[PDB]
């Protein structure tokens, strides 16, 4: 039921102007990544070539090339969040899970996002569509508690 979903998605975005990006968003949202078995149909329905459909997928970071773990943990690494000790939070958390920055697994996936808008709340994280701020060395406990 992959071709079906993909065809439905493409039908949903038929006639738009520059509809590649939205189509790719929807694809990623459906499966979890942009499968190489879905570079061709998109290109065909949009009149592009596999090459461009691959280049677009490569340029952008939000488009996964392979799936992530059951959970995901994005952790800002920008100036503000760095200021109020993001490094410490990072260390504590990666020791808790045992996965360094960028190092993924089947359980989780620790990565950087470089901003969330929570600059005032300097230490900021995104755990499974849930934003968290003021991440002290204690909040990490609950971060991992609800996150097996």
């Amino acid at each position: 039921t992959d071709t079906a979903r993909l065809r439905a998605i493409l039908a949903a975005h038929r006639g738009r102007e520059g509809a590649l990006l939205p189509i790719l968003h929807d694809v990623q949202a459906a499966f979890g990544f942009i499968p190489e078995d879905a570079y061709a149909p998109i290109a065909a329905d949009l009149g592009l070539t596999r090459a461009e459909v691959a280049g677009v997928v490569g340029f952008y970071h939000d488009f996964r090339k392979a799936p992530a773990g059951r959970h995901v943990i994005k952790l800002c690494r920008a100036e503000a969040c760095q200021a109020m000790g993001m490094d410490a939070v990072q260390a504590r958390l990666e020791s808790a899970l045992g996965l360094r920055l960028g190092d993924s697994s089947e359980a989780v996936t620790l990565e950087a996002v470089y901003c969330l808008g929570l600059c005032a709340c300097a230490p900021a994280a995104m755990v499974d569509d849930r934003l968290v701020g003021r991440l002290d060395a204690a909040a990490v406990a609950g971060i991992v508690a609800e996150l097996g």
Partner: protein, 493 residues
């Protein structure tokens, strides 16, 4: 009693959800009216979970309400530990002019009634009576300029776009604030979203466009939904203007904030920055003229045209005119947002208004702008906030981002992070950012080692980056480095 629990990310992050839960629970356990509201953020994030309660005198605010402190309510609002009194009467909220973010945190964002009651839809319903040229001249009289760059008068831009023939022109809002410390757009689109709708409709009626777009990031998942709901709700109010706008979500690239790369990403291609023989105004989205502007610039348009351009020109210095929001984050006691006229010294903004630091330590650095901005120390406290003077005193002021670092910060780490950023965030179109950044990131490590053949090397690298790079992601990246090096030499061996 009426309860106003923010629905912003700055509140949801701090646990406004738990506050809601505890409140509802305690109300179910203690019989009461239990009227809850879901307004936005007032712009004071050091107490963002503020539980404003209605009273005949006004609205009394509460501190960073943790669910543990919720039980304290329903007993006495006067004998409460976290008492702020009239939220409007706080010296942090009083000193703000607060025009653009006027109706942000005191209304339900997706409530048309409260919006219309707040002088909303005035700019639009006033513009349609006017002509495409009158509106442009209004905008130009005020000299609003550019809020996401060096500052280019938007009047001239609108003029250039208008004096260009095509079957279908375009308009784009570049809300892709990947810069650090910059969270004004997020607030303005998560609170008072209809302001953007109104401004864009006005701009489209002015320039001569019928189709419009708004480019949101992916790191702002709440704002996206809010704006979608706004666009879907204001469809009737958009019909009268002859304007159909759609939201377009980014895909995780800081370089897609550049006009060219932005409209290149809109087109379905990969966001590589274009050269500039043609300007996006002349030839942009699908080769058709497009007016591409920032949100703060398209949030003042309605105000400017309605409340009178002559009023908006009153605020500011000789060259820079109008009010700007100053976003203050990082290590700082009272963070958040301060909307005010130019000419203010960051000394006042960082030592008096927002106290000092959260750690209680002094401040060694104050970075205006994002990571494309110099590191201004305590000594520069005598430098007022305006484009010309800051751009004159070896720096940059863009989206008014403002972070703070205390004495326990290492400038080496930050100068390295600058290049690391310029490296990870890079389209790869021109060499001075492709290779320059990933080589500077090595040169900085070498400097850390102790080599002396690195510093002059670094200077030359930075200079070629400045003078060669196609865009500003690799033409202003040198500024953090050079500033951290010339201001804080006691950290760079």
């Amino acid at each position: 009693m009426k309860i106003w629990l923010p629905c912003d990310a700055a509140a949801k992050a701090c646990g406004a959800e738990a506050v809601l839960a505890a409140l509802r629970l305690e109300a179910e356990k203690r019989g009461g009216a239990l009227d809850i509201a879901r307004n936005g953020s007032r712009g004071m994030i050091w107490l963002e979970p503020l539980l404003e309660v209605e009273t005949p005198a006004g609205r009394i605010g509460f501190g960073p309400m943790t669910p543990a402190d919720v039980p304290a309510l329903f007993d006495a609002l006067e004998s409460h530990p976290k008492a702020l009194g009239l939220v409007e009467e706080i010296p942090f909220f009083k000193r703000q002019t607060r025009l653009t973010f006027a109706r942000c945190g005191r209304i339900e964002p997706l409530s048309l009634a409260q919006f219309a009651a707040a002088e909303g839809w005035a700019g639009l319903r006033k513009a349609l009576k006017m002509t495409p040229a009158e509106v442009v001249e209004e905008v130009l009289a005020s000299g609003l300029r550019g809020r996401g760059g060096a500052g280019f008068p938007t009047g001239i831009k609108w003029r250039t776009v208008a004096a260009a023939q095509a079957d279908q022109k375009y308009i784009v809002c570049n809300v892709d604030e990947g810069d650090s410390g910059s969270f004004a757009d997020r607030m303005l689109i998560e609170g008072d979203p209809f302001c953007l709708v109104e401004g864009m409709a006005i701009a489209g009626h002015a320039v001569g466009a019928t189709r419009g777009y708004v480019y949101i990031r992916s790191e702002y998942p709440d704002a996206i939904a809010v704006m979608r709901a706004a666009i879907a709700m204001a469809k009737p109010f958009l019909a009268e203007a002859g304007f159909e706008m759609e939201v377009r979500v980014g895909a995780g690239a800081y370089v897609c904030g550049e006009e060219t790369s932005l409209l290149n990403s809109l087109e379905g291609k990969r966001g590589t920055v274009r050269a500039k023989p043609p300007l996006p105004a002349l030839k942009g989205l699908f080769g058709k003229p497009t007016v591409v502007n920032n949100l703060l610039s398209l949030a003042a348009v309605p105000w400017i045209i309605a409340h009178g351009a002559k009023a908006y020109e009153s605020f500011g210095m000789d060259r820079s005119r109008g009010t700007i929001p100053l976003q203050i984050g990082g290590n700082v006691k009272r963070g958040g947002l301060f909307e005010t006229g130019f000419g203010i010294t960051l000394g006042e903004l960082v030592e008096d208004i927002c106290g000092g630091t959260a750690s209680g330590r002094p401040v060694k650095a104050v970075q205006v702008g994002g990571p494309l901005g110099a590191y201004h120390p305590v000594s520069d406290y005598h430098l007022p906030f305006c484009y010309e003077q800051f751009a004159g005193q070896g720096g940059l002021v863009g989206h008014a981002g403002l972070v703070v670092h205390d004495d326990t910060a290492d400038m080496l780490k930050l100068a390295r992070f600058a290049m690391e950023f310029c490296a990870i965030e890079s389209c790869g179109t021109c060499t001075p950012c492709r290779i320059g950044a990933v080589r500077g990131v090595e040169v900085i490590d070498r400097i850390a080692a102790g080599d002396a053949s690195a510093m002059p090397l670094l200077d030359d690298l930075c200079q070629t980056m400045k003078l060669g790079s196609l865009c500003a992601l690799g033409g202003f990246t040198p500024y953090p480095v050079q500033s951290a090096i010339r201001h804080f030499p006691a950290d760079f061996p």
